[PDB]
């Protein structure tokens with residue numbers, strides 16, 4: 001009356017666990033993971049076993065079932081390389097690394113000031129200032145050239161834009177990074193994140209009983225990077241903590257400001273989540289920005305459509321920047337499209353707390369279930385012509401097809417801060433510049449814990 005199949009009758013990935021661990025040892029990474037999975041899905045179907053009890057799915061069909069099984073305490077897998085550092089230095093873990101009742105406790109005291117629509121209305125104007133400074137700075141340099149255009153690799157400037165906006169919205173501090181040269185503090189922070197991501201892949205696929213002695217140099221490499229990260233994050237904390245102890249302001253001065261004033265969370269559990277918000281707000285946000293710019297340069301037909309929208313609502317957004325979330329549907333659709341093809345978050349994890357059925361297969365509890373978004377977003381059955389950058393496919397309205405930020409109570413905490421940074425930067429670049437490129441070959445994607453472009457194209461910014 002439904003049909004359920006044995007778990008042991010699942011299509012099995014041909015690989016051998018141990019050899020892939022030795023391949024990662026040798027290659028110092030797993031850059032082509034998204035491709036090896038996409039291929040396997042094409043050979044075995046929309047579900048298969050992979051003892052790297054792990055099950056890999058790809059259909060919105062399955063995400064919905066996975067949220068139905070989400071308990072009151074959804075459970076992702078512990079990320080030991082990250083947790084190890086937290087306890088080596090006697091730190092508390094944030095929402096990204098917690099599970100069970102402690103996670104629910106932190107999460108419910110963070111949602112109001114980090115994710116709610118009322119909080120977005122307060123920090124969104126602050127993001128807008130940074131986005132306007134980004135284009136104002138870019139326009140000054142552009143109109144200095146004879147052809148009123150600047151051609152460059154924008155990945156540095158964009159990454160320093162996301163550090164600016166994130167620090168302003170989190171701590172209410174303004175660091176001279178947009179319109180000015182990078183500081184050694186930021187360049188060291190970005191390099192630590194790069195190494196923290198690299199070394200994570202080298203250690204996350206083998207238990208600590210092996211990586212301890214086969215790759216101890218990497219563990220050192222890994223903890224050093226975190227130290228540099230906790231250094232940058234904690235200097236942001238120590239500044240705002242001392243600044244608030246002497247005056248409790250009456251206006252909005254950032255997110256972490258409210259979290260400290262409320263004091264619903266212990267000091268160590270604010271520092272913990274304040275680390276995860278400072279650290280996970282740079283790469284994950286900046287790379288979809290770059291790909292959005294890239295895809296618009298490849299499709300000027302789509303670009304001008306977005307520029308028209310953004311030029312019309314330009315006035316009502318300068319009056320109240322909050323309107324950007326509702327006056328720029330096409331640009332919000334473009335962002336949905338970028339993440340469909342270039343999902344910085346490759347997969348969603350759930351250790352199911354209860355039996356379930358996927359693709360008419362029995363899934364026991366305690367099983368790890370990974371949703372592989374790279375193939376989910378490329379399944380022609382659900383996305384007609386998935387090879388095409390078509391923002392208008394999201395405007396019609398199809399509910400679990402857009403899950404780059406996860407689902408359930410666990411869904412991304414910074415979801416709306418990221419959307420505002422991406423949206424507001426693209427809105428002010430579209431109404432002042434044209435983004436053009438000769439580079440029209442697809443950009444190869446790399447897996448270093450996140451899915452990111454292995455190359456950054458040359459982009460021209462021509463002014464209007």
Ligand code: HEM
Pocket residue numbers: 076095096097107276277278280281282284285288339343344345347348349404405406407408409410411412413414415417418
């Ligand atoms: C395009 C940008 C981003 C994408 C695609 C993304 C993706 C994701 C995904 C897939 C998850 C897992 C959720 C789940 O498994 O249910 C997640 C969780 C999380 N993200 Fe984001 N993220 C982005 C930006 C950010 C930003 C900017 C921040 C902080 C400022 C952030 C902080 C977090 C945290 C703390 C969690 C853990 C939430 C929890 O476990 O309850 N992310 N994100």
Ligand SMILES: N#Cc1ccc([C@H]2CCc3cncn32)c(F)c1
Pocket residue numbers: 096275276277279280281284345412450
């Ligand atoms: N501490 C810390 C921390 C937490 C999260 C991220 C990124 C990686 C994947 C993801 C999804 N949302 C944000 N992130 C990070 F880089 C550092």
